[PDB]
Amino acid sequence: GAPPIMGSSVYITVELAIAVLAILGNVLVCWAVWLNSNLQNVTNYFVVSLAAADIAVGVLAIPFAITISTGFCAACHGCLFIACFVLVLTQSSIFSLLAIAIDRYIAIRIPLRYNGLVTGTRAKGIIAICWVLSFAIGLTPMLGWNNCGQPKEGKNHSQGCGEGQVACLFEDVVPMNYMVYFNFFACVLVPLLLMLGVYLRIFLAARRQLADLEDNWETLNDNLKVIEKADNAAQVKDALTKMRAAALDAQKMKDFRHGFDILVGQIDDALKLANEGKVKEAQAAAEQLKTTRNAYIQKYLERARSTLQKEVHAAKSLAIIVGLFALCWLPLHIINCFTFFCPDCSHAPLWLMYLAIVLSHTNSVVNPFIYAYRIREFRQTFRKIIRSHV
């Protein structure tokens, strides 16, 4: 078998290339938010926390991955920290992603209460607590859920380790039942299934609210034709009461409230001539609603449609970032399951283990590109930053 150093050199060179890109791209995300007040909403504070975690992957997690790949002699508990510190950063990324899903769900479901409920100070508090839980969760093995009490005395005497030390290797010190049940199933897979369900409810809601609009818009228009072609005062009365209720459930910013007070006011005039029995004077009064609909109502339809379509396109960009996290991290998780559940399977080869590790660390590079390709405000700020400074 070849000198371990040769394949070892490839792995290191690759891991360092990844760390450079992780730092640069996510530093540029942070610079952008710092610089552009349009980017300084509550959602993007979570985006920033996510970015700071991806920077820390290049600054610390990747240097740790290189170290533990050597099996150098180390005191067990210090070896656990080198091995698990990435689990803290990964857990903080999940919390951050989960908070974004909820933040956007609160914006689609209750737009009118969003600003008083999701504030910057509350977000700061959430981010501060999620980082505290991430250290707790990601370093649980250090509290005694570890194989430190079972040292591999073959490996440790070969390496020449001393009194208290172990050959520092991930699968030798981190119990695989912590990795599968606690880290994967509970702390990664369940949160990602939640985010899946949140983003589903976001899209149903926007799809619901949209059809409610288009369905309110035809209620307004259809009932016009009823009036136009009626012959007794009563058909008009029945047709008008439907628009009125439709015009207020749509109503459910002083130009918008003047437009609908022109509209309902007209409806309430045609409803009075109808109730009085004047049939033609009610059809002609109800024809004055065309002027209001062309001047005011169509314009709330098109504007209410844009904001909903813009929320959908925005939640789709954020759903992609949750997909890439999963795409990138599931291989390393799925191999742990095989190692743990299939004792009669051969262990996955070394080359695949470090290919799945390298894959997991590339997730720290992709988010900056997603923002740039999918978010105008981020792309335009990236260009200003680059164009000017470099």
Ligand X SMILES: CC(C)CCC[C@@H](C)[C@H]1CC[C@H]2[C@@H]3CC=C4C[C@@H](O)CC[C@]4(C)[C@H]3CC[C@]12C
Ligand Y SMILES: CCCCCCCCC/C=C\CCCCCC(=O)OC[C@@H](O)CO
Ligand Z SMILES: CCCCCCCCC/C=C/CCCCCC(=O)OC[C@H](O)CO
User: Which of 17, 63, 139, 339 touches ligand Y by CB under 6 A?
Assistant: 63
- Give the count of residues interacting with Na ion (CB under 5 A): 2
Tokens found for residue 300: 């709330």
By CB under 5 A, residue 216 contacts Na ion: no
Q: At what angle do helices 76-109 and 42-56 cross, to 10 degrees?
A: 160
> Which range binds Na ion by CB under 5 A, 50-58, 242-250, 263-271, 282-290?
50-58
Q: How far is CA 214 from CA 74, 264, 267, 353, in A?
A: 67, 19, 20, 53
Of 239 and 357, which CB lies nearer to ligand ZMA in the complex structure? 357
For the CB of residue 97, give the shortest distance to ligand X in the complex, in Å. 15
Got the DSSP string for 192-226? Answer: HHHHHHHHHHHHHHHHHHHHHHHHHHHHHHHHHHH
By CB under 6 A, residue 60 contacts ligand Y: yes
By CB under 5 A, residue 93 contacts Na ion: yes
* Cβ pair 298, 218 in contact under 8 A: no
Residue pointed to by tokens 């047709």: 239
* Cβ pair 203, 312 in contact under 8 A: yes
For the CB of residue 81, give the shortest distance to ligand Z in the complex, in Å. 23
Judged by CB under 6 A, the chain residues 350 through 389 that form the site for ligand Y are 352, 355-356, 359
Q: Residue 228 corresponds to which amino acid?
A: E
- Give the count of residues interacting with ligand Y (CB under 6 A): 43
By CB under 6 A, residue 11 contacts ligand ZMA: no
Residue 96 DSSP label: H
Mark 349-368 with x for binding to ligand X (rule: CB under 6 A) and - for no binding. Answer: ---x----------------
By CB under 6 A, residue 289 contacts ligand ZMA: no
By CB under 6 A, residue 336 contacts ligand ZMA: yes
By CB under 6 A, residue 297 contacts ligand ZMA: no
Residues 6+ apart with CB under 8 A from 36: 377, 381
By CB under 6 A, residue 55 contacts ligand X: no
Q: How far is CA 174 from CA 106, 277, 349, 356, in A?
A: 39, 85, 19, 18
For the CB of residue 317, give the shortest distance to ligand Y in the complex, in Å. 17
For the CB of residue 202, give the shortest distance to ligand Y in the complex, in Å. 19
Distance CA 176, CA 183 (A): 10
Return the SS3 of 74: strand
Tokens found for residue 153: 């005395």
By CB under 6 A, residue 338 contacts ligand X: yes
* Cβ pair 109, 198 in contact under 8 A: no
For residue 24, the partner it binds in ligand X, ligand ZMA, ligand Z, none, with Cβ less than 5 to 8 A by kind, is: none
For the CB of residue 371, give the shortest distance to ligand X in the complex, in Å. 22
User: Which of 226, 359, 370, 385 touches ligand Z by CB under 6 A?
Assistant: 359
Q: At what angle do helices 350-374 and 4-35 cross, to 10 degrees?
A: 20
Residues 6+ apart with CB under 8 A from 163: none
- Residues forming contacts to ligand Y in the complex (CB under 6 A) are 27, 30-31, 33-34, 40, 45, 48-49, 52-53, 55-56, 59-60, 63, 66-67, 70, 72-74, 124, 127, 131, 185, 189-190, 193, 326-327, 330-331, 334, 341, 345-346, 348-349, 352, 355-356, 359
